[PDB]
Design an enzyme around this catalytic site. Structure first.
Site, PDB file in Angstrom:
ATOM      1  N   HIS A  76       0.871  -1.195   0.000  1.00  0.00           N
ATOM      2  CA  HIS A  76       0.000   0.000   0.000  1.00  0.00           C
ATOM      3  C   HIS A  76       0.902   1.238   0.000  1.00  0.00           C
ATOM      4  CE1 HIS A  76       0.412  -0.017   4.466  1.00  0.00           C
ATOM      5  NE2 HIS A  76      -0.008   1.236   4.451  1.00  0.00           N
ATOM      6  N   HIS A  78       1.571   3.973   1.943  1.00  0.00           N
ATOM      7  CA  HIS A  78       2.198   4.707   3.052  1.00  0.00           C
ATOM      8  C   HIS A  78       3.720   4.536   3.042  1.00  0.00           C
ATOM      9  CE1 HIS A  78      -1.730   4.800   5.639  1.00  0.00           C
ATOM     10  NE2 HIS A  78      -1.608   5.889   4.903  1.00  0.00           N
ATOM     11  N   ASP A  80       5.935   3.335   5.127  1.00  0.00           N
ATOM     12  CA  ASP A  80       6.589   2.104   5.580  1.00  0.00           C
ATOM     13  C   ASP A  80       6.566   1.023   4.510  1.00  0.00           C
ATOM     14  OD1 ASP A  80       3.780   1.871   5.892  1.00  0.00           O
ATOM     15  OD2 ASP A  80       3.845   0.848   7.803  1.00  0.00           O
ATOM     16  N   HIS A 141      -7.043  -1.316   6.432  1.00  0.00           N
ATOM     17  CA  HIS A 141      -6.165  -0.226   6.887  1.00  0.00           C
ATOM     18  C   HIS A 141      -6.103   0.902   5.860  1.00  0.00           C
ATOM     19  CE1 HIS A 141      -2.600   1.883   8.324  1.00  0.00           C
ATOM     20  NE2 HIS A 141      -2.048   1.680   7.142  1.00  0.00           N
ATOM     21  N   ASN A 172      -3.081   4.319  13.152  1.00  0.00           N
ATOM     22  CA  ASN A 172      -3.428   5.418  12.251  1.00  0.00           C
ATOM     23  C   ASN A 172      -4.529   4.948  11.314  1.00  0.00           C
ATOM     24  OD1 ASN A 172      -3.487   7.662  10.503  1.00  0.00           O
ATOM     25  ND2 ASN A 172      -1.774   6.861   9.298  1.00  0.00           N
TER      26      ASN A 172
HETATM   27  O1  LIG Z   1      -0.656   2.074  18.784  1.00  0.00           O
HETATM   28  C1  LIG Z   1       0.181   1.354  18.391  1.00  0.00           C
HETATM   29  N1  LIG Z   1       0.651   0.216  19.167  1.00  0.00           N
HETATM   30  C2  LIG Z   1       0.156  -0.081  20.507  1.00  0.00           C
HETATM   31  C3  LIG Z   1       1.327  -0.766  21.186  1.00  0.00           C
HETATM   32  C4  LIG Z   1       1.731  -2.105  20.553  1.00  0.00           C
HETATM   33  C5  LIG Z   1       1.283  -3.348  20.962  1.00  0.00           C
HETATM   34  N2  LIG Z   1       1.842  -4.285  20.214  1.00  0.00           N
HETATM   35  C6  LIG Z   1       2.643  -3.723  19.312  1.00  0.00           C
HETATM   36  C7  LIG Z   1       3.427  -4.311  18.303  1.00  0.00           C
HETATM   37  C8  LIG Z   1       4.194  -3.509  17.469  1.00  0.00           C
HETATM   38  C9  LIG Z   1       4.172  -2.129  17.634  1.00  0.00           C
HETATM   39  C10 LIG Z   1       3.388  -1.554  18.632  1.00  0.00           C
HETATM   40  C11 LIG Z   1       2.614  -2.357  19.484  1.00  0.00           C
HETATM   41  C12 LIG Z   1      -1.087  -0.940  20.635  1.00  0.00           C
HETATM   42  O2  LIG Z   1      -1.699  -1.391  19.622  1.00  0.00           O
HETATM   43  O3  LIG Z   1      -1.503  -1.186  21.812  1.00  0.00           O
HETATM   44  C13 LIG Z   1       0.820   1.634  17.042  1.00  0.00           C
HETATM   45  N3  LIG Z   1       1.644   0.741  16.543  1.00  0.00           N
HETATM   46  C14 LIG Z   1       2.234   0.949  15.384  1.00  0.00           C
HETATM   47 CL1  LIG Z   1       3.300  -0.332  14.782  1.00  0.00          CL
HETATM   48  C15 LIG Z   1       2.046   2.137  14.666  1.00  0.00           C
HETATM   49  C16 LIG Z   1       2.702   2.343  13.439  1.00  0.00           C
HETATM   50  C17 LIG Z   1       2.504   3.527  12.738  1.00  0.00           C
HETATM   51  C18 LIG Z   1       1.661   4.510  13.247  1.00  0.00           C
HETATM   52  C19 LIG Z   1       1.015   4.305  14.462  1.00  0.00           C
HETATM   53  C20 LIG Z   1       1.221   3.109  15.178  1.00  0.00           C
HETATM   54  C21 LIG Z   1       0.598   2.838  16.406  1.00  0.00           C
HETATM   55  O4  LIG Z   1      -0.257   3.776  16.988  1.00  0.00           O
HETATM   56 ZN   LIG Z   2      -0.286   2.242   6.348  1.00  0.00          ZN
HETATM   57 ZN   LIG Z   3       2.209  -0.140   8.759  1.00  0.00          ZN
END
Ligand SMILES: O=C(N[C@H](Cc1c[nH]c2ccccc12)C(=O)O)c1nc(Cl)c2ccccc2c1O
Ligand SMILES: [Zn+2]
Ligand SMILES: [Zn+2]
Length: 220
Positions: A76, A78, A80, A141, A172
């Protein structure tokens, strides 16, 4: 943990996952992608979330596998998933994405894969691409997200449409379709009922239970 590191590890014969870390809006996150062997060449699924990270990934691939990356697919639009396409192109890699993914990347200001995939237009469509199958499950997503299946290994790469078990938030959702997402996850369940490893877009690999976990999180 620390920003800007890149690793690879083995999933099956000729299948690896790449993992990278990056800074975003004041926080550090891991992110996953895939590498699949096709004879004496490699297919890359998704960038390592930036130019510097993507250049390091090509160097790790060269030192640990030693076969050339000839093609890449972004699942997609974005950063990443496409951040690093220009490094790949300069290295001679042919880069691909759906037409919708390419238009959305341009609207957003991101890097743009050169070539357009054919045959991925409606929810449920699937196409062969070398050693993998590409599937469009519907909006989740984002409206353009794809997932990737490897028939030789029975491995499903869900990308950002599939959340790890430890997630409590969908993150997001600015471009998400929360109303469609559960239906799109069900389409994956029904299309790949036998998959025995599922790799989310961020976090630890799991089983098919990740699809129902995703549904549960997105509903709440
Ligand atoms: O809120 C997130 N994570 C928390 C913590 C977490 C649990 N398990 C995880 C495993 C990987 C990363 C974060 C977690 C969750 O869901 O409780 C969150 N995570 C990622 Cl990746 C994001 C990537 C890009 C933009 C926003 C993001 C984001 O908000
Ligand atoms: Zn994305
Ligand atoms: Zn992602």
């Amino acid at each position: 943990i620390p920003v800007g590191e890149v690793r690879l590890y083995q999933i099956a014969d000729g299948v690896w996952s790449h993992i990278a870390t990056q800074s975003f809006d004041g926080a550090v996150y891991p992110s996953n992608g895939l590498i699949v062997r096709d004879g004496d060449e490699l297919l890359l699924i998704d960038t390592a979330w930036g130019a510097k990270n993507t250049a390091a990934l090509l160097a790790e691939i060269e030192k640990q596998i030693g076969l050339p990356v000839t093609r890449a697919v972004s699942t997609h639009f974005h950063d990443d998933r496409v951040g690093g396409v220009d490094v790949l192109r300069k290295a001679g890699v042919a880069t691909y994405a759906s037409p919708s993914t390419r238009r959305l990347a341009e609207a957003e200001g991101n890097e743009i894969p050169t070539h357009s995939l054919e045959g991925l237009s409606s929810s449920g469509d699937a196409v062969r691409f070398g050693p993998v199958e590409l599937f469009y499950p519907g909006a989740a997503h984002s409206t353009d997200n794809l997932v990737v299946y490897v028939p030789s290994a029975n491995v499903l790469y869900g990308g950002c449409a599939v959340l790890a078990l430890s997630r409590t938030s969908a993150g997001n959702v600015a471009d998400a379709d929360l109303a469609e997402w559960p239906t799109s996850v069900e389409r994956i369940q029904k299309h790949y009922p036998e998959a025995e490893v599922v790799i989310p877009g961020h976090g630890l690999p799991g089983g098919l239970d990740l699809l129902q976990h995703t549904a549960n999180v997105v509903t709440a």
